[PDB]
Symmetry: C2
Subunit: 49 residues, 2 copies
């Protein structure tokens, strides 16, 4: 995902809704502000970010 960290926070929520935050998916983020993302909703799921 090449996009701002605000876009990235938004697209992750949609990805969860879509059954795409699981061990099958690996997401590389272009943003340097990745560390700013609330990651509480996703760390238990097994996705790779």
């Amino acid at each position: 995902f090449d996009c701002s960290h605000e876009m990235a926070a938004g697209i992750l929520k949609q990805a969860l809704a879509m059954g795409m935050m699981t061990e099958y998916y690996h997401y590389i983020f272009t943003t340097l502000d990745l560390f700013a993302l609330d990651v509480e909703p996703y760390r238990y799921s097994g996705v790779n970010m």
Copy 2:
């Protein structure tokens, strides 16, 4: 799931967290108050309830 509808609301949240609300899972509910459950978090996911 044989349990009260309040238990069922609770166990569904845990099932979501666990990557178990998807098209692979089919849940039959014993409770007659199934229709009382907030189903907004789950209807887009493809689970069968």
